[PDB]
Design a protein around this ligand. Structure first.
Ligand SMILES: [Mg+2]
Lengths: 150, 98, 49, 49
């Protein structure tokens, strides 16, 4: 096994934290939420491929047990392809206009809501901890570092 | 009327040079600062001349010799070559955003 | 649209109205056109860094 | 260190016209990284103020 079985107790205890019945079964959406929260930041493609179901169109129908979650994590911990911080730094600087990397927060919100997986504005409103004033500039260094810290 | 307006205006002559010639022109330094995500594992981390760096990126991109011509201070490209690199750059930046 | 803080300004709005004024003061029907420009203009919209 | 690196730029004389050219901009990149500025802008300002 690619993971110590003794540590499975922590995962089993953490699975019993959501506002659900917790009777040894969790829906596909619940599995994805647990993987996004506890497990390493996954992606829709990884969730649909790694023991997933591309043909599935309603995640609220399929259901899995607790033991079925450890193989998913063990496989994602070897098949994942997470990039370094330099890639994200360059991607954020590509949208820079002054060169110093202090563009207003509107640019980050637009890039997160439109380009890519188009996130919801209500979700990014909680992460954007910038200051709103005459300048309203936000730095990419500390922000991206705290975002990728995990 | 439409034919005489296009011949005198030089629309045809303006497109011929665009195909036979190299309409796109990117500076050595500007070409590296904008097309580095396409071939990241092709230039050492240390400093290097802008001309020597572009020579490695073009070779790694598997571009035909007839689709480019390195000059003295600007890299030339034929019609449709630089446009293709922009599309590939978007896919790379899109993956970085994802 | 790229400023937000000062979206919809008096300058960007007046730029669209400053042209019809100069046009209506010397444009009308002709033999080969219904709205000809009897004067050549060269607008130069400046931009900051 | 940046002041030391300054001057190493071996400018070349163009065969067509009398204009400066930087075939090797390594020293320019080093000076820009030390002083904390851009390379393209510095080159454009040094060769075309
Ligand atoms: Mg007219």
């Amino acid at each position: 096994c690619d993971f110590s079985e003794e540590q499975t107790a922590e995962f089993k205890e953490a699975f019993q934290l959501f506002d659900r019945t917790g009777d040894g079964k969790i829906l596909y959406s619940q599995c994805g939420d647990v993987m996004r929260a506890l497990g390493q930041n996954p992606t829709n493609a990884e969730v649909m491929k790694v023991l997933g179901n591309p043909k599935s169109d309603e995640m609220n129908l399929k259901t899995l047990k607790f033991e079925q979650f450890l193989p998913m994590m063990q496989t994602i911990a070897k098949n994942k392809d997470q990039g370094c911080f330099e890639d994200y730094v360059e991607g954020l600087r590509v949208f820079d206009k002054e060169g110093n990397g202090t563009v207003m927060g509107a640019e980050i919100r637009h890039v997160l809501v439109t380009l890519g997986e188009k996130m919801t504005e209500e979700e990014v409103e909680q992460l954007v901890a910038g200051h709103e004033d005459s300048n309203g500039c936000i730095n990419y260094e500390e922000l991206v570092r705290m975002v990728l810290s995990g | 009327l439409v034919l005489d307006q296009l011949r005198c205006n030089g629309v045809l002559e303006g497109i011929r040079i665009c195909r036979q010639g190299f309409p796109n022109r990117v500076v050595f330094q500007e070409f590296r600062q904008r097309y580095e995500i396409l071939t990241p594992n092709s230039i050492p981390k240390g400093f290097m001349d802008g001309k020597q760096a572009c020579v490695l990126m073009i070779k790694a991109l598997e571009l035909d010799s007839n689709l480019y011509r390195i000059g003295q201070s600007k890299v030339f490209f034929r019609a449709g070559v630089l446009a293709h690199l922009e599309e590939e750059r978007d896919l790379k930046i899109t993956d970085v955003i994802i | 649209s790229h400023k937000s803080k000062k979206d919809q300004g008096e300058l960007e709005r007046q730029l669209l109205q400053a042209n019809p004024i100069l046009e209506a003061f010397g444009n009308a029907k002709t033999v080969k056109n219904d709205n000809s420009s009897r004067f050549g203009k060269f607008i130069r919209i400046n931009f900051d860094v | 260190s940046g002041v030391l690196q300054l001057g190493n730029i071996v400018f070349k004389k163009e065969r067509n016209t009398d204009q400066a050219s930087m075939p090797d901009n390594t020293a320019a990149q080093k000076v820009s990284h030390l002083l904390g500025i851009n390379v393209t802008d510095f080159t454009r300002g040094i060769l075309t103020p």
